Amino acid sequence: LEKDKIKFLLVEGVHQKALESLRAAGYTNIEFHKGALDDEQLKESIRDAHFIGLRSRTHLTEDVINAAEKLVAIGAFAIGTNQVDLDAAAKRGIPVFNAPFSNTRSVAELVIGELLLLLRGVPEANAKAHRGVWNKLAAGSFEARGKKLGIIGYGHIGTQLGILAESLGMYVYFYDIENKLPLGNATQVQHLSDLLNMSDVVSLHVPENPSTKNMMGAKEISLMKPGSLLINASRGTVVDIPALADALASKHLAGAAIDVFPTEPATNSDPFTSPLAEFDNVLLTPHIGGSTQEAQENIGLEVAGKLIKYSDNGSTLSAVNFPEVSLPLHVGRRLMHIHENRPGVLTALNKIFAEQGVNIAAQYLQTSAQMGYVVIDIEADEDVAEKALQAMKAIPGTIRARLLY
Amino acid sequence: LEKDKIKFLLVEGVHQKALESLRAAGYTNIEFHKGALDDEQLKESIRDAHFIGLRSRTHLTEDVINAAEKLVAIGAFAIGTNQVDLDAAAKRGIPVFNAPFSNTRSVAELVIGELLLLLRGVPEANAKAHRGVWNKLAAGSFEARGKKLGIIGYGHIGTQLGILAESLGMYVYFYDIENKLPLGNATQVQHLSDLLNMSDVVSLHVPENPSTKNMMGAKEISLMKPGSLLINASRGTVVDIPALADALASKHLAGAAIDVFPTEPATNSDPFTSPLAEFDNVLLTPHIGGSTQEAQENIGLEVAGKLIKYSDNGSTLSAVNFPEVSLPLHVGRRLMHIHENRPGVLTALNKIFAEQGVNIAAQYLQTSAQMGYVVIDIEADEDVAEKALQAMKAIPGTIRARLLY
Amino acid sequence: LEKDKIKFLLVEGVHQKALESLRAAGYTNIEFHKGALDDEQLKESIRDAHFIGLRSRTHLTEDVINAAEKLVAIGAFAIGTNQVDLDAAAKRGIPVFNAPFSNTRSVAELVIGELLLLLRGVPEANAKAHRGVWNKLAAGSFEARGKKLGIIGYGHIGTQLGILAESLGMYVYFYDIENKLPLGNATQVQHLSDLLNMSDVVSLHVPENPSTKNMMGAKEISLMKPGSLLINASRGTVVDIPALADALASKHLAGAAIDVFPTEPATNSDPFTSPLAEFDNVLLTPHIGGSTQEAQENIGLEVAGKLIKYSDNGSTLSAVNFPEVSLPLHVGRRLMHIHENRPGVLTALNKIFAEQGVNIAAQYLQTSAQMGYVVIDIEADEDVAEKALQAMKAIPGTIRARLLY
Amino acid sequence: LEKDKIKFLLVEGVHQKALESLRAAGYTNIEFHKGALDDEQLKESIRDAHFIGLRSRTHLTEDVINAAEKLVAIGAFAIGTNQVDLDAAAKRGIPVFNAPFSNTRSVAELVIGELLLLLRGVPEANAKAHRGVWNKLAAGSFEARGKKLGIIGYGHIGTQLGILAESLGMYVYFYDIENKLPLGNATQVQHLSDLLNMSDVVSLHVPENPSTKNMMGAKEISLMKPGSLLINASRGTVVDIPALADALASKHLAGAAIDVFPTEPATNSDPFTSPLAEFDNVLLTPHIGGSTQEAQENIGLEVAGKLIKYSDNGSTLSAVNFPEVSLPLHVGRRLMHIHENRPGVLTALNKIFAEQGVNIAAQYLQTSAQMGYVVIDIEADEDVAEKALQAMKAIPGTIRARLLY
Numbered sequence A, B, C, D: 001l002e003k004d005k006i007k008f009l010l011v012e013g014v015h016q017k018a019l020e021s022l023r024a025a026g027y028t029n030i031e032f033h034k035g036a037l038d039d040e041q042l043k044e045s046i047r048d049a050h051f052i053g054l055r056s057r058t059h060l061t062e063d064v065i066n067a068a069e070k071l072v073a074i075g076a077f078a079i080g081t082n083q084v085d086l087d088a089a090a091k092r093g094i095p096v097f098n099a100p101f102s103n104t105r106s107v108a109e110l111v112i113g114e115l116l117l118l119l120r121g122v123p124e125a126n127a128k129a130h131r132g133v134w135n136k137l138a139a140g141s142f143e144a145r146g147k148k149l150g151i152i153g154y155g156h157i158g159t160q161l162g163i164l165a166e167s168l169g170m171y172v173y174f175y176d177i178e179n180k181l182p183l184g185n186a187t188q189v190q191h192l193s194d195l196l197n198m199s200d201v202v203s204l205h206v207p208e209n210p211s212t213k214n215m216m217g218a219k220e221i222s223l224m225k226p227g228s229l230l231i232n233a234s235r236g237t238v239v240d241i242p243a244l245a246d247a248l249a250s251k252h253l254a255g256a257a258i259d260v261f262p263t264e265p266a267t268n269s270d271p272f273t274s275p276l277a278e279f280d281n282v283l284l285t286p287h288i289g290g291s292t293q294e295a296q297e298n299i300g301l302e303v304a305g306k307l308i309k310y311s312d313n314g315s316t317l318s319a320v321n322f323p324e325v326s327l328p329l330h331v332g333r334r335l336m337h338i339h340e341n342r343p344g345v346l347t348a349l350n351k352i353f354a355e356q357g358v359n360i361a362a363q364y365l366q367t368s369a370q371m372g373y374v375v376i377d378i379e380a381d382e383d384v385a386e387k388a389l390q391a392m393k394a395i396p397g398t399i400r401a402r403l404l405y
Ligand SMILES: NC(=O)C1=CN([C@@H]2O[C@H](COP(=O)(O)OP(=O)(O)OC[C@H]3O[C@@H](n4cnc5c(N)ncnc54)[C@H](O)[C@@H]3O)[C@@H](O)[C@H]2O)C=CC1
Pocket: A079, A100, A101, A103, A104, A107, A152, A153, A154, A155, A156, A157, A158, A175, A176, A177, A178, A205, A206, A207, A208, A211, A212, A233, A234, A235, A259, A260, A287, A288, A289, A290, A291
């Protein structure tokens, strides 16, 4: 304590729940910033920080990282991590954590909201009325009850959209490359062409990979029904946008709602441009599918939590660049040791304790191609432990070591 | 039999379902127009029409009414009846029907879909995207789940909305002038000003009358929760729009969705205007709160129902310009008499039967200020019912009479 | 008022809500008894009572009734009415009311409770342990989730059992002689033999009529599956009990739960006897399917309510021995008149008013084979009304007449 | 391959599902008995058994354990393990498995079905019917819906019960020693004495330990609601039965249902006794709270699972007499070592590899007071893994070792 000494750098305004999680766990040394940092402020604030929490805007680059001399772990208080040089962090024994599934509710809700209005032609009607034009009609406008919703991608987000969708009395269909257990009354469809053929609304919730690239093409969309609707709040590489423009202006689709795009304005000052901008029957949203207070508080708890666990017990459960290891806290003293993955290391580490008659209660080592990470609980008094820490460090191939408690 | 001679006039493209169930009832004499008729064509095609179904643009004026020789009843295949001269129709013993509550589901689905998006600031963000501005920001966006919906007017629409909002995880509170039995875990607040203080979202669902006129004024809006949303898809008299504008401008409210206005464009070619058109964080819809295909079908089944029933059995249950009468069909010949509300008419009608030894089985007479309407079941031959009808037709004060069967 | 004068006799301890309903409506002249009355106390308490409320134990016999000289209406605060001489009451113009559907919840709950334990062999195990015998086994014992429940009789009770049954994850099947709209996920089965063939538990909810007499016979029960269960909380004539004994002792059925029997102990002191009494795997209950506080308070409100409505406005909606008539309360003064169903009466009644220039606002007459009942609102001051009341009485065929307000 | 040589012994008629999923895993060497084995047959059929699955009557005693030459692991296909000598099994490096929570649904369905009937006084009324007494009386019978269920111990069973009780319309409150996240609209009461004051039905679902021993004593029972019900299907230590008897006798409680007792009959031929056997308004069941066919199948899938896993990959996750170890299967040859918990063993094991240039990929060692258990993945040939195994087997302190693959 010596915890009043362990420093937390937090940028881009994470949720205050992250901060109150740290305090609750006795970590008060917090430097907090609402916005993002230029390099000279970043390189300067980070250099004596044991942990950093950032969002999607800060680039933790190989050099920024090597400029940080006391850095123990990194927390992406967000989903994405590409703003971070994982291999750079990993070579310095710095694990990186994220919040992969902490805003599925926000995405599910957005698609409900959006399909209701698109079904009803409200976006077109809303834009028209902001330009003085009144357009009252029932023809072409539908209720949601009794319509068939097709979910492409039945994961965390796809499944919970399913539930909200039944609650409103929609029939729910879905297609995954994996077989899944239908929830509520949902039905899996074998071929995508059949799902497309009988859905009134189609919503995509797939990840970003060669199999999902331009997955919704001219061909696929020609397979949706006349007057159907396409929503993409997944990833911007998933839908062929020019194919969709053609489909909107020929009126094969009645509308659409898009949140993610092949290229996205780098910041809020840069211009947004898309051929879909000229259609009033389309909703366009600045990749905000997950951008809520509720979600921002979820991520702030999970990721703040994840950092505290690692500080307090060395858990790398769910680290994205690192060997996963965690150990239930039972007995004696905890140490950890990150090193190059080569023979003899673990035996040298344990030999430090066998030689002097010290018992080892538990140990967990896991490896990646090039690196090994181990946690040991040993039974000894403070002194012996301080000293073994010292000896652990000298082991050929040692990257880093720490006495946790 | 007789049913073939009975001509039905349908204008303005009512729902096929009206034709279908008129047909199932044994009514096949039908002139159907998907469009509106012109003075010249209306007056020549209604000349021999026993019934007419119309929508919102056909104007049933005393001129037209008094020319239509054979007319028995009118059906407004809509909620409103301002297009029809109710007083003239009444004067000729012609009941007017409509469908005040066949729109319930469309208005509720609309309120939900709007409150989802406003909470998320999507309308404003969509507006910005369409003009090339990217505004990615999670501050101020909220999930719907966990928030408090405050419903004013817990009737047909209020209650069904509360159900949906509970399926979304919202907490449902309401305020009404009389005491209501709550559905699910909704909660009646006894004072309005508490209902407004606590609500994240307020939605109005009340009639148009002296007591609701500008009921949401500056005072009431100033009581709503800071950063809350107001939604009105009830009627256009109900909310002071200028005061709503001030509330939005000062940022006391974070948005609204208005579907009805103090005055509305008559045609669709007519221009629309509103102080609220200056806000991107406001949804403005052209009074389409009930404009769906499903609603058109509800209205179609129900109003045809009401005409078929009035035809087959004289029921004026739910007529809007008329004494309400209904009588279970059990026995004998049923006869119908419409007359001036003055002493002695009822007696003379019944005397036709008493004096010739004919037993009366049922009779229901109700009155308006000015008119009497009475249905009668008698126990007699066909001949007798026929002569009776003739005598009835000559009772002083008589407006019209009919042998139903 | 003159309401402090109108007397209510209440026997057999109806729920106190009935009493507080009467007070709320200004009727305080209440004689209340917990138990039932012998004839000499009954003939004596009833003779000056305008209304009586009884249960299933008091026999209101033709003579008891004729002994009551001020009796206006009868209320069966229960379902059954056979304890009452309907034709005797009806010939004196006394309508009889009941509570036909005010305990469906109590019956639905009982069958849930009972099928859970029967599935689990708990009744047998419970009786065994009260005799010192411990019998722990899993074989033959099942959970309710995933079992198929067959409802024979999908009415008020059958439908709500369905809902409770799905809540527990049972598959719900049913058979009715009428086509019905399935609730939740319930399925109608065309032939009874198929329902019997695939139900794990079968529960009967049919009325008492020639079509339901011994409906469950040896034949039918040989059609249930080995180890299935039969529950009857409908009527005692519905199930062939000796057929069921044979089926229980051969173990074709694993158990049963019966609440109603062909003959039932006339009172609580008389001996109950049945061949099913020797089976521990059978539940036997003293026709208590509907016997709850909740139900007793429901019936007390409905029936007390029904009496007050008739006193206050002459409504005979739902009277079981009487012509149904009711009139919305609009204008002037209300009178009612019960009479023999013969020509001339109604004309004489209305003539009383036509002759002196008094307007009639509304009238509702309805008839049975032998009797007519009419309600009239007329527009006159107190005096004219008192007098017409007097004249109404003298009309040949008049049974009874009353000035309500 | 090897899997054929691996003999599985199943006694006491476990669920077919155990055989099925053992088979799917590639394990077909199976001796199955639907019944219990006698000393003489058990000891000769287990002699070469690699695994054994048993129930409650087979007594795995140190005599049997130490004779069984080839035994690797034991599976208690039940919740309890008192029949197995855990300490002896541990001493020989033989883990014991069971299924503590495969019974959840059966106990909940039981509590519901019992609370339905007790509220309705059916047990007492059924008891009377069976001896020829008819007791038709609605006073004191209540519907379940609207009443308050008070759950003590909101774990696996507590929570799932609260869900069912909410489907029945009951209000769900709970009390637990640590803070729980409520499901549906359940409500955690912070003081127990408030939970007891307000409850109409109390149900206990807590472990057997020093803190629960007679936790429902005279004091606690006297705090329950007058006319309330107590249900215990947790464990027999938890409730003072004599004091429960006094509460029932004084009519402070209106009934109870007890499934577990301070001592229980061993065989089914043994006699049962309880002061509570004097009450008709008490349900007594022979500790069958989890005795269903479905539970037998759950337990069958799960325990076989645990044996198959320990076989295929060494996981001792959830073993009851053993260090818990689990390791993701990624690379190389996996080896397993069980030994005395004393300095120097770990080091010698790892030295076998370090000194011959063999890379260690993962390792998980956990310890009990007295024993060490460690799994290891190495990067080496088949020959090498084989010689290694031999050397490992000779490390001082070694109890047993195994080349998993
Ligand atoms: N719009 C926004 O602001 C945000 C976007 N997302 C994105 O939404 C997507 C889904 O997120 P989660 O549901 O949590 O991911 P998930 O992994 O839980 O769901 C992905 C599902 O897609 C299925 N799938 C993968 N490839 C497929 C293929 N090519 N064809 C058909 N099905 C396929 C997988 O089997 C899996 O079930 C992700 O790409 C995520 O990044 C997530 C949060 C916010």
